[PDB]
Each structure stands twice: as C-alpha cells, then as structure tokens.
Coordinates of C-alpha atoms and ligand atoms in Angstrom, one line a residue:
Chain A
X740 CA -7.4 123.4 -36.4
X741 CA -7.7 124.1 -32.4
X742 CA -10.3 122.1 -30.6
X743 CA -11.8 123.2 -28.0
X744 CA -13.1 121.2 -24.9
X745 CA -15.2 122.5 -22.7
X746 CA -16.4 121.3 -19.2
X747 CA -18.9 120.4 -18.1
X748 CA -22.0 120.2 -20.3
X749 CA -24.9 121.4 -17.9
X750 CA -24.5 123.0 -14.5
X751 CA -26.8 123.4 -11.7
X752 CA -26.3 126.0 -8.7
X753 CA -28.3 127.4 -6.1
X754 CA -28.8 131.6 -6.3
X755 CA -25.4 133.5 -4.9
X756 CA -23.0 130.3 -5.1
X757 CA -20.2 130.6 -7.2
X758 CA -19.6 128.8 -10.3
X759 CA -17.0 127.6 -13.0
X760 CA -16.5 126.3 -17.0
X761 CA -14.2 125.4 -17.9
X762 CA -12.4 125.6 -21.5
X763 CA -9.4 123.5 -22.9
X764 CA -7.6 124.5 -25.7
X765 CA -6.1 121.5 -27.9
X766 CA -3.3 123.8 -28.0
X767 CA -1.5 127.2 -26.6
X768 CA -4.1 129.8 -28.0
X769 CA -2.3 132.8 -25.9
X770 CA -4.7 134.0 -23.9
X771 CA -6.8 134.8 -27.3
X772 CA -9.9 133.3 -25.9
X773 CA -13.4 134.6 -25.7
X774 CA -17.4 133.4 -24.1
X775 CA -20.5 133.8 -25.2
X776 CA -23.6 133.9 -22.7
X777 CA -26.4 132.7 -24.6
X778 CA -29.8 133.2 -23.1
X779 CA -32.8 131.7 -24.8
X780 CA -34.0 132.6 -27.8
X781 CA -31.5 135.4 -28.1
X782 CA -28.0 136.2 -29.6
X783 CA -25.2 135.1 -28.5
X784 CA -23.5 138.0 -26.6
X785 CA -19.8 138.3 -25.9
X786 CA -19.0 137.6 -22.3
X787 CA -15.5 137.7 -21.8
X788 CA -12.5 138.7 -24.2
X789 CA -8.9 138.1 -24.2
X790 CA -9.3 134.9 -21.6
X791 CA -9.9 137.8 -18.4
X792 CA -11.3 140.6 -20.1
X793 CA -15.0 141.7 -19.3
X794 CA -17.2 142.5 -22.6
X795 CA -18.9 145.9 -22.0
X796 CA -22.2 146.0 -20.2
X797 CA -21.7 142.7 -18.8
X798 CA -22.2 141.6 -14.8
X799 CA -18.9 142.2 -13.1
X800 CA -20.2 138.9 -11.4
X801 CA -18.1 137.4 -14.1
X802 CA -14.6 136.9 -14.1
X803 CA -11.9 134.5 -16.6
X804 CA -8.9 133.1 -16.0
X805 CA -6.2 131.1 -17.2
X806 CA -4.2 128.3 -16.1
X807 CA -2.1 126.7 -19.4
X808 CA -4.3 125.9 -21.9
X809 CA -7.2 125.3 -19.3
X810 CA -9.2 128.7 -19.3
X811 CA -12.2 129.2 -16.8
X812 CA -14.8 131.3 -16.9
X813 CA -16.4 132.0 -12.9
X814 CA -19.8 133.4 -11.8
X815 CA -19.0 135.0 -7.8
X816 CA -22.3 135.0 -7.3
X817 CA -25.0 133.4 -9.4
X818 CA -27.9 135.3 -9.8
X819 CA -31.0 133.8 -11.4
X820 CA -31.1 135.7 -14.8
X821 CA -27.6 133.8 -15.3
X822 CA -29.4 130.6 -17.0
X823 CA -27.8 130.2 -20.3
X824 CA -25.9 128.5 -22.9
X825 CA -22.1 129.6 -22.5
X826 CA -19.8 129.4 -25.3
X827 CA -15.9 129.5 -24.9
X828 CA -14.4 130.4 -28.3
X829 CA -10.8 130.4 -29.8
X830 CA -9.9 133.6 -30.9
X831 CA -6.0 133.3 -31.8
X832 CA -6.1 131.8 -35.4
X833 CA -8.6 130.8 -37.5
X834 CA -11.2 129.2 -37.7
X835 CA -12.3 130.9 -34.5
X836 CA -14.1 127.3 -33.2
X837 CA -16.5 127.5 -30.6
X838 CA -16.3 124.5 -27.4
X839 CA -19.3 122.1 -27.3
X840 CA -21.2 124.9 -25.1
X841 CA -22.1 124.5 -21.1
X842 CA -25.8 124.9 -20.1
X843 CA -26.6 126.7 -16.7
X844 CA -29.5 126.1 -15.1
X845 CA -30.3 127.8 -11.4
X846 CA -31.5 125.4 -8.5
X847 CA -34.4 126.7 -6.5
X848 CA -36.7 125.5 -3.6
X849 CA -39.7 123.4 -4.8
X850 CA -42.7 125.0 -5.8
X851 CA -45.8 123.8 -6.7
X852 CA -47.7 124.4 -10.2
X853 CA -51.0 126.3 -10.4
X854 CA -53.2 124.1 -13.1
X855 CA -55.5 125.8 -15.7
X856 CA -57.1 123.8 -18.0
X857 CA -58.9 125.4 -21.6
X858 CA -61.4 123.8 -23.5
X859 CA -61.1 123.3 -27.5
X860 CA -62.5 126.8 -29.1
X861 CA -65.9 127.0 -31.6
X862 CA -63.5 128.2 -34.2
X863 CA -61.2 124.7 -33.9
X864 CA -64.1 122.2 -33.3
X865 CA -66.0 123.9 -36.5
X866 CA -62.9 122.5 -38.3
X867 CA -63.4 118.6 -37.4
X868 CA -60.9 118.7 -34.3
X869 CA -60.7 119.5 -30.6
X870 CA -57.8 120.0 -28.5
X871 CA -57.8 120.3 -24.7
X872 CA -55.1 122.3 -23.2
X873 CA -53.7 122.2 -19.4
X874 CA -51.9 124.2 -18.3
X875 CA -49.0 123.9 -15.3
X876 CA -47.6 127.3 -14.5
X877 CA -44.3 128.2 -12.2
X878 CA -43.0 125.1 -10.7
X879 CA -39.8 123.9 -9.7
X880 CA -38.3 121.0 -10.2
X881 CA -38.7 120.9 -14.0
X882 CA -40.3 116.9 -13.8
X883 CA -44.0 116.6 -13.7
X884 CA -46.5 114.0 -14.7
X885 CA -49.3 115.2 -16.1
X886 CA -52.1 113.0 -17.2
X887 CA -55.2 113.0 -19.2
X888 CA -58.7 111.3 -18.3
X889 CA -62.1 111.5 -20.6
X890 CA -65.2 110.6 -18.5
X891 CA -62.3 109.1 -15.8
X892 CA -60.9 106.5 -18.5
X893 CA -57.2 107.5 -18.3
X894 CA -55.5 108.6 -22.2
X895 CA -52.6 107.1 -23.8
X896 CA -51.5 108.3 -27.0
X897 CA -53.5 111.4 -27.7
X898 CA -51.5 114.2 -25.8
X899 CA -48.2 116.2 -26.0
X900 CA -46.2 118.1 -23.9
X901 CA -44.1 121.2 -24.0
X902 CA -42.3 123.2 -20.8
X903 CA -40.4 126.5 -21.2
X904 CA -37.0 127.1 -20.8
X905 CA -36.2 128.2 -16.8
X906 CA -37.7 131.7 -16.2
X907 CA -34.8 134.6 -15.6
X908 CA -36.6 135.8 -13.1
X909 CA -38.3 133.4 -10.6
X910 CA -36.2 129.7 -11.9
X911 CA -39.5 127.8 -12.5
X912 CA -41.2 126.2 -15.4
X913 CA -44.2 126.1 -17.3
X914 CA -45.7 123.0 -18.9
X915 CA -48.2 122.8 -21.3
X916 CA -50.0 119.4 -22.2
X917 CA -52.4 119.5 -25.5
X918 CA -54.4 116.6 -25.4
X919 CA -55.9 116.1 -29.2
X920 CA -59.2 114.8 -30.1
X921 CA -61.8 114.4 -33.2
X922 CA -64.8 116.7 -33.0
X923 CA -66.5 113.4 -33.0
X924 CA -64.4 111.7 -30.5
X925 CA -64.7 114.9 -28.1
X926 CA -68.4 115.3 -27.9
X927 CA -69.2 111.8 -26.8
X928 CA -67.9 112.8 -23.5
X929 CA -68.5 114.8 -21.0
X930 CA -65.3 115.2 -18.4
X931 CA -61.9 116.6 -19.3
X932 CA -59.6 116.1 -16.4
X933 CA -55.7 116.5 -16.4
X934 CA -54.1 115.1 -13.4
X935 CA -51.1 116.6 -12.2
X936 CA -48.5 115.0 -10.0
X937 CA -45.6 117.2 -9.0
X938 CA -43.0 117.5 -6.0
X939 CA -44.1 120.4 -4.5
X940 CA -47.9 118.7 -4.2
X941 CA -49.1 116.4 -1.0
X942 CA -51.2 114.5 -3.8
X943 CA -51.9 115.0 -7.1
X944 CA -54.0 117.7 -8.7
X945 CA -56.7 117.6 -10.8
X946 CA -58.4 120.5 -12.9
X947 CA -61.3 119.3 -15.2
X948 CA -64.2 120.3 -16.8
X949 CA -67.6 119.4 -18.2
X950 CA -68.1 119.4 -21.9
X951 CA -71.8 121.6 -22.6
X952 CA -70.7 123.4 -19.9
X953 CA -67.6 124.4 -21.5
Chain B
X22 CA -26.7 152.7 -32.2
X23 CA -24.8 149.6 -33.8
X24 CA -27.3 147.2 -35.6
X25 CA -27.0 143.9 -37.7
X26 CA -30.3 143.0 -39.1
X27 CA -30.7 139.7 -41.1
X28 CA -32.9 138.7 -43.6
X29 CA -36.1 137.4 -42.4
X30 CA -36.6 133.1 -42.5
X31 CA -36.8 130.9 -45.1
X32 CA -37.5 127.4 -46.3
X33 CA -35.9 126.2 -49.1
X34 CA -35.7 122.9 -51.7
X35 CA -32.9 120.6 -51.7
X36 CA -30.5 121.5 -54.6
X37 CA -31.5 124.8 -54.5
X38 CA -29.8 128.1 -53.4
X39 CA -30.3 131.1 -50.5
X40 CA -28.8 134.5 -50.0
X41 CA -28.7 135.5 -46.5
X42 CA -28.3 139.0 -45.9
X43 CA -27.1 141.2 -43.2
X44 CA -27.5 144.9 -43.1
X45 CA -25.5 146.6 -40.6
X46 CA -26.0 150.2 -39.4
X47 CA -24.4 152.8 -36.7
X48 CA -20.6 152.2 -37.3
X49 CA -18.2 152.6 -40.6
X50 CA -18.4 149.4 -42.0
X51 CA -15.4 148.9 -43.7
X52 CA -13.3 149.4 -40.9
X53 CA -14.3 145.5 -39.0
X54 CA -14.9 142.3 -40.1
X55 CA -18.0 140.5 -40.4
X56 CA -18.2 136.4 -39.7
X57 CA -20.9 133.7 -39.8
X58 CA -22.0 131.1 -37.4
X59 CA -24.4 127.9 -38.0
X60 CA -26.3 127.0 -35.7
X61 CA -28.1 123.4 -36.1
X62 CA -31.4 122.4 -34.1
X63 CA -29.7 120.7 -30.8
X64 CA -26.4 121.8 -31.6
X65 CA -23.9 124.5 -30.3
X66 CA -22.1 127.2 -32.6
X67 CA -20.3 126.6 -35.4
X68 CA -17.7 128.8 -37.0
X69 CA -18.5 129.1 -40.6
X70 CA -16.2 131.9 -42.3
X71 CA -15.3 135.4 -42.0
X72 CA -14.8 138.2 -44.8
X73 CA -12.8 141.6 -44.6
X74 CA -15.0 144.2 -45.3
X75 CA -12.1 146.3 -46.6
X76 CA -10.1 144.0 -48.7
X77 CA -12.7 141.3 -49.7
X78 CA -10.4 138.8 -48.5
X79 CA -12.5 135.8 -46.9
X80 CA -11.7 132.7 -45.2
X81 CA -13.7 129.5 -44.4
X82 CA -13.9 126.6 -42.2
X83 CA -12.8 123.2 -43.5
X84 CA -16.7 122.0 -43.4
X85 CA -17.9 125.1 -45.1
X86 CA -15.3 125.9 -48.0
X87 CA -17.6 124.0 -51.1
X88 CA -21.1 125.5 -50.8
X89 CA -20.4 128.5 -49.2
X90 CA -19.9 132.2 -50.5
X91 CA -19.6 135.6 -48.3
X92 CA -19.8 138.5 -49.8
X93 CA -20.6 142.4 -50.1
X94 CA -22.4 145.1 -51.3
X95 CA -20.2 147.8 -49.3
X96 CA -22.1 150.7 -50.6
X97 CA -24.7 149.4 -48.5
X98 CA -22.8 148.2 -45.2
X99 CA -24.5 144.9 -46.0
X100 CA -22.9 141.2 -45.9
X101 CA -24.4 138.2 -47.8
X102 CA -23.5 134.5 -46.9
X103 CA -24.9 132.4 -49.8
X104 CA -25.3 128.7 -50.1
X105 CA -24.7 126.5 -52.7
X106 CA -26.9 123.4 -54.0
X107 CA -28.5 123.0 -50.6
X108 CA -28.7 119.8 -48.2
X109 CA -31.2 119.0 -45.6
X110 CA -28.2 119.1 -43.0
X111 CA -28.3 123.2 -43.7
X112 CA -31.1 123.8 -42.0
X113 CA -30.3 125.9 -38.8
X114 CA -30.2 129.2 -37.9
X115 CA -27.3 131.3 -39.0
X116 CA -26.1 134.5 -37.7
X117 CA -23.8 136.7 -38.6
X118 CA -21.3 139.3 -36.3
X119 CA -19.6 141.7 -36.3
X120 CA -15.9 140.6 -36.1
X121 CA -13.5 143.5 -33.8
X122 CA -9.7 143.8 -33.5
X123 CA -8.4 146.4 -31.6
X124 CA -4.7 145.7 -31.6
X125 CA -5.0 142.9 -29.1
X126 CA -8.2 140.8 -29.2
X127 CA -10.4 139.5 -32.0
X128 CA -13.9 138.8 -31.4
X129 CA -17.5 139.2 -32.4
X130 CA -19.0 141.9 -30.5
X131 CA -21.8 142.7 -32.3
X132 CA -24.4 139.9 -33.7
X133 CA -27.3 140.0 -35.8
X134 CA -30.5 138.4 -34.7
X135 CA -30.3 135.0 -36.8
X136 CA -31.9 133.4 -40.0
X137 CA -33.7 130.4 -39.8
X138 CA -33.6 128.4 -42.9
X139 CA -35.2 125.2 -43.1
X140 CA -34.0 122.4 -45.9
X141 CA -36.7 120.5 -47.0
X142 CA -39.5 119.0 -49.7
X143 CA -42.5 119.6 -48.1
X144 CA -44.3 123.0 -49.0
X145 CA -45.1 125.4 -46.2
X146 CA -48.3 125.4 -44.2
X147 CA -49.4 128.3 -42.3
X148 CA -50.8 128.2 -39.0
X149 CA -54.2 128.0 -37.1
X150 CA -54.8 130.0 -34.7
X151 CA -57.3 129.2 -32.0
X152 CA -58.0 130.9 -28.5
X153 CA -57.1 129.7 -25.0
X154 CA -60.4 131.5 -23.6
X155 CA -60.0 132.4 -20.0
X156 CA -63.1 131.2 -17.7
X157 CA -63.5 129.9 -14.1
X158 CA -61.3 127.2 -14.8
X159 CA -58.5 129.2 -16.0
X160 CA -58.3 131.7 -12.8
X161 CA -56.7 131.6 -9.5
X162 CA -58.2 134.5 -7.2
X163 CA -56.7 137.5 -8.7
X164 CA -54.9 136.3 -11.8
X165 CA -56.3 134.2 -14.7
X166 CA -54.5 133.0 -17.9
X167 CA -55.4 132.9 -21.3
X168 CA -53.8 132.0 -24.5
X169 CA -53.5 131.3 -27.7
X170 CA -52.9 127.8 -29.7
X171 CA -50.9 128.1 -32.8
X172 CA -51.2 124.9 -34.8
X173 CA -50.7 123.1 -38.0
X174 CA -47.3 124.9 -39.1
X175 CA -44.1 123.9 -41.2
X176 CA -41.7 124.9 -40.9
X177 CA -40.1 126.9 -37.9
X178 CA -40.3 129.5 -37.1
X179 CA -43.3 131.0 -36.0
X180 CA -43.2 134.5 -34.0
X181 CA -46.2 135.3 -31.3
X182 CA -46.5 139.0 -29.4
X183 CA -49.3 140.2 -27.4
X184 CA -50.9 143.4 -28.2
X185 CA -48.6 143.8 -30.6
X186 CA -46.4 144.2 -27.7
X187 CA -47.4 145.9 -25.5
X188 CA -48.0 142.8 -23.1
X189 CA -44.9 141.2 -21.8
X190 CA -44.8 139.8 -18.4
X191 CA -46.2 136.8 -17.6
X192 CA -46.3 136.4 -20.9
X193 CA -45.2 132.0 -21.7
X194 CA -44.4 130.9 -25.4
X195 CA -43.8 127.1 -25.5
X196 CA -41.8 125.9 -27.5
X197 CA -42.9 123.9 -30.7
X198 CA -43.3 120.4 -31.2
X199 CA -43.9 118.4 -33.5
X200 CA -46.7 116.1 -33.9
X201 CA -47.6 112.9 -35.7
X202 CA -48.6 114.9 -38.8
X203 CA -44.9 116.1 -39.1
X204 CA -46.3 119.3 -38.6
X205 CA -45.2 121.7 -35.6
X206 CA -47.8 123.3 -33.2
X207 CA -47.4 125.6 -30.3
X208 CA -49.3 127.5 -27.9
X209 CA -48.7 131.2 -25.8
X210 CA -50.3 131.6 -22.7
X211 CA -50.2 134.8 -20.4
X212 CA -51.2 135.2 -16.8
X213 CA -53.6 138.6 -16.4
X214 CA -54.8 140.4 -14.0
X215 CA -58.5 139.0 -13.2
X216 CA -60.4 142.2 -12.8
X217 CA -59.2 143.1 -16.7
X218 CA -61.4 140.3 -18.3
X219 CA -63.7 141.9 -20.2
X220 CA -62.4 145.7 -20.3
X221 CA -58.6 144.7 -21.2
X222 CA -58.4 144.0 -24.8
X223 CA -55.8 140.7 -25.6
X224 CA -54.6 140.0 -28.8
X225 CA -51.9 137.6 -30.0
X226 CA -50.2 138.6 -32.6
X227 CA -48.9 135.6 -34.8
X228 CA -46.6 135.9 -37.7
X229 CA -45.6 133.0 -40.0
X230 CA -43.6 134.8 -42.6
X231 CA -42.5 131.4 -44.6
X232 CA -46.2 130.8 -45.5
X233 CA -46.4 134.8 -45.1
X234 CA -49.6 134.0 -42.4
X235 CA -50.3 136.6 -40.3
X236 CA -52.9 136.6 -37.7
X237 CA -54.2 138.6 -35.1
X238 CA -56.5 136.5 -32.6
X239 CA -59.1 138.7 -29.9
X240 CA -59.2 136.1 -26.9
X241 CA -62.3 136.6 -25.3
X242 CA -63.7 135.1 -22.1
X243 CA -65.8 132.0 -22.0
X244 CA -68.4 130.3 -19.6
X245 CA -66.7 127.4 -17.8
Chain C
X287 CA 2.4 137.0 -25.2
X288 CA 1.1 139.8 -27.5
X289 CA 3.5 139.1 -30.0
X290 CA 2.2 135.9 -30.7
X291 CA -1.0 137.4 -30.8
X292 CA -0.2 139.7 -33.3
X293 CA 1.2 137.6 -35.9
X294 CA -2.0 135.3 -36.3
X295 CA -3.7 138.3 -36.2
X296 CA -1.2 139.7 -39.5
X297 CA -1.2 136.3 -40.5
X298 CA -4.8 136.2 -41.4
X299 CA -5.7 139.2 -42.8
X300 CA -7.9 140.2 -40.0
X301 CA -8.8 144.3 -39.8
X302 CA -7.8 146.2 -37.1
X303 CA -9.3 149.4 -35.3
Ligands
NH4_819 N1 -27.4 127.8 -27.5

C-alpha cells in the first residue's frame, strides 16, 4: 500500500502570507493526488484534485503542485477563514490512504479577553450541586491562566477548562472555565472570583461576584 | 442538489453489531462510487473501503477487511457500512462519500455529514441542562453573554442551536470534556445585543439523540 | 501519465462518468 507523508503537522501564518504542505508519496502515484480542507466540526471537502486541479467552489487562493513524488499544496494569500485540518490523499490505486493531516492555524495581533462570569442556576443548585462558570471571550494568543478564588482562598482541583477552536472570522479564542462545587460547599461562601491572566492584559483581571447577591 | 445524509449517532455494546446508513439524493446513484472513512477521536482520516454502486463489487483496506461489510439497497440510492462484533477501538465518526471518476481523476467529492458511534459498556445518560443567566456581571456596555450549561452526558455527541436556529453569530459551543465522573459536560455561550435582554426571546436548543433527550432551555436574566 | 492512470483506475473496478 502507498504511504503517505505529509509535512508539517501544524502551521502558523500571519493573514495574506503565503503558505505550503507538503505531501510525499512512498511511491510514484502519477499525479493521482487529492486534499481535503477540513474546517471544524464539518466534512471534509475536496480541495484539490489531480495534484493541480482546483475542486469547484473552492478559493482560487489555492494552488498544487508537483515535484516527483513530493506534491505541495500553496495558499497565495492566507485569509483567516483558511484554519483547518488539510488532508493530502492518494488517489491512483487503492486503498485511497489519506497523509497524517496538517493543522493551520492563523497568527494574529494580541488581543485581550473580555471576562464574564455566571453564577450556578436555582434549577442546578436544587439538584445538590453548583457550578460557577467564567467566561474569557475573543483573545489571541490561545494561552491563558485562568484561576478560581472562594472568599480569596485560591482553588485547586475543582475546575475545568475548555477553549474553542480559532474563530474563521476574527482568529481569536474563547475559554470557558467551570469551576464545580456541592450545594453545601457553595453556600458557605460568599465571593466567586476568577482571575484571568493573559498577554494582551497589563495585569491580571478579575470578575467576581457575591453569593445572595447572585 | 447532491445530498448524503447518514444515519443519526449511536452507542453501541462491545460484541455487538451497527448498520450505518447513507441515503444519497440529487444525482443517479448507480452511476459513482460510494467509500467510507473512520475517523477516530484525535486522529486523522482513514480509508476504510469503497463499493461500486453498479456492479456491487467492493474493496477494503487491509485494517478493515474482517468486521466490515458495505453494501446496498440501490432501489433506494442508499449505502450501508455495517460492523461486525464490535471493539471499543470502533468508536469514531465515520463518513461516507461519494466516490467520482471522470476519465482522469478519482476522488470523493461529495461527503455525508458523519456518524458518531461510540463503543462502550456504560449505558447512556442524557444531559442537564442549566442556564448561563445574563446579569451585570455578564455585560460589557452594549453586548452581554448568556448561555447555556449542558452537563452530565455519555456519550458524544451532543447538538446545541439557538432559537432553533435562528441565532448564529456570536454564537460559542465549547467543546466537551470530560470530567471525573467519566461523564462529558459542555457549555454554549452567545454574545447579545444588551438592549434585547428582556424583549429578545433565547432558547437553546439541546438534542441528545443517544439517550433521545431533548431540551429546550428559556435563558432569562438574573440580578447580579 | 494518464495511461498509467487509467489502468489502476480499470484495474480496480472503479466507475466512471
Ligand atoms: N480533522
């Protein structure tokens, strides 16, 4: 069966720079090679066909090409609804086998996270357990510490995190951190605080609230 | 307009056996190919097999020759891929395309939207749904965000829309993660226009169809 | 290099438009 090896595994490029994958075929596949752009939490779509052929409705931004068995696929001029998973396939014989995949990711300037915090709702703390959520919306880079403090005593342990896939649009994040308490636990305190440190702040944030307010 | 719709998610027992389906629409069936492609949680695509819709003729990969099975029901323009005495290692999602050749190139131009089937022993759980209430400390001038939490759930996946919807931008679904329970939990969050609290209408629209929950949550404003 | 092509094509069975 033909391997393929493609190159490299994630990407990074600032908006209208011009990028390349690369593809290498184990053997000669004959120019019978195809990519997939997938974007998140979508189908894979065909890309490119025949090595240099562009799939219809696709950017004319993207280009193939081949040199031997090394075939590349090239963005002219990266555009920030490019982020995506991009798949290099053999198409000659099969099994048509797919290359390990290349994910693209779109460098931005920094930009700084607005913070929303929710309180547990009646509904949840009626069944025994309350959970805190803060939310960090629309920043760039994607790292950010983000911690928890009850009445100023700093958590450990009782808290995950979860941050989107880079927006098409904008090339930020989001980040949500749940931190989880008993009913019990929760109402023998009175301030929620999530403290958010980021690049694009001075000093850290912090977005809080009082329990009986709230 | 060409269409490949799949068979909605499923969670199956170890040993046991699935039926995928995929029921295509808008071109004549018989005359292209139809192939299947895994793909596991943190892994890329993986070429499974592919059958000719004319001749029945099918063809496998190495890994996927035992267990495996494509077939027809051509009446129907529908493909099936069915798996055999089933291992955890099957869970993924699994789509299937359709495969073109027009005298030069082969590839799969068409794809359906994916079937998530999940391996396991554990019996489903269906999700609770709580509010993200907007208040004071949700808002920023003339935006504020509210949400949904959607916990408690096995397995993936879990589908969330907004007024059934009709709300889009701004709209954030996290990702799911798993906590100590070994149960996953998520949440949706939307930025809104401030001066809509309390006239706009926001539901979330949550759809577990392994555990066949469905929920529709009002999120309302709190004080903060 | 269509020739090629063409033969794995034949070779496995594949339908053409
Ligand atoms: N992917």
């Amino acid at each position: 069966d033909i391997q393929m090896t493609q190159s490299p595994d994630s990407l990074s490029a600032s908006v209208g720079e011009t990028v390349t994958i690369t593809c290498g075929a184990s053997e000669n596949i004959y120019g019978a090679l195809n990519w997939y752009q997938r974007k998140q939490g979508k189908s894979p779509q065909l890309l490119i066909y025949g090595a240099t052929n562009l799939a219809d409705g696709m950017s004319s931004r993207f280009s193939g090409s081949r040199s031997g068995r090394q075939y590349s696929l090239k963005i002219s001029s990266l555009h920030p609804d490019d982020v995506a998973t991009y798949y290099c396939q053999n198409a000659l014989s099969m099994p048509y086998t797919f290359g390990g995949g290349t994910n693209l990711e779109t460098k931005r300037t920094v930009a700084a996270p607005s913070v929303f915090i929710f309180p547990p709702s009646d509904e949840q703390l009626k069944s025994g357990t309350a959970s805190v959520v803060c939310l960090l919306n629309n920043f760039y880079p994607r790292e950010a510490k983000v911690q928890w403090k009850v009445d100023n005593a700093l958590q450990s342990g009782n808290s995950q995190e979860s941050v989107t896939e880079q927006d098409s649009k904008d090339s930020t994040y989001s980040l949500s951190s749940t931190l989880t308490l008993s009913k019990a636990d929760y109402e023998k305190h009175k301030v929620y605080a999530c403290e958010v440190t980021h690049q694009g702040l001075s000093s850290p944030v912090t977005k809080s609230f009082n329990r009986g307010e709230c | 307009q060409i269409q490949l719709v799949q068979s909605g998610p499923d969670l199956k027992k170890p040993g046991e056996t699935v039926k995928i389906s995929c029921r295509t629409s808008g071109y004549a069936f018989t005359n292209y190919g139809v192939n299947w492609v895994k793909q596991a949680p943190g892994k890329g695509l993986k070429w499974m097999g592919w059958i000719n819709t004319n001749t029945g003729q099918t063809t496998y990969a190495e890994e996927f020759r035992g267990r495996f099975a494509i077939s027809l029901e051509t009446s129907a323009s529908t493909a099936f891929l069915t798996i055999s005495n089933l291992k955890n290692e099957d869970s993924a999602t699994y789509f299937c395309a359709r495969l073109i050749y027009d005298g030069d190139y082969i590839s799969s131009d068409f794809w359906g939207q994916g079937t998530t089937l999940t391996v396991s022993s554990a019996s489903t759980k269906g999700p609770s749904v709580f509010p993200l209430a907007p208040s004071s400390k949700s808002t920023s001038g003339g935006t504020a965000a509210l949400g949904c939490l959607v916990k408690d759930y096995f397995p993936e996946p879990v589908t969330v829309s907004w007024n059934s919807g009709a709300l889009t931008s701004g709209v954030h679904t996290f990702p799911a993660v798993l906590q100590s329970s070994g149960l996953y939990s998520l949440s949706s969050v939307v930025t809104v226009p401030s001066s809509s609290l309390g006239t706009q209408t926001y539901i979330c629209n949550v759809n577990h169809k392994p555990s066949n929950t469905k929920v529709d949550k009002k999120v309302e404003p709190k004080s903060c | 290099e269509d020739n090629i092509r063409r033969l794995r094509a034949l070779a496995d069975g594949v339908q053409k438009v």
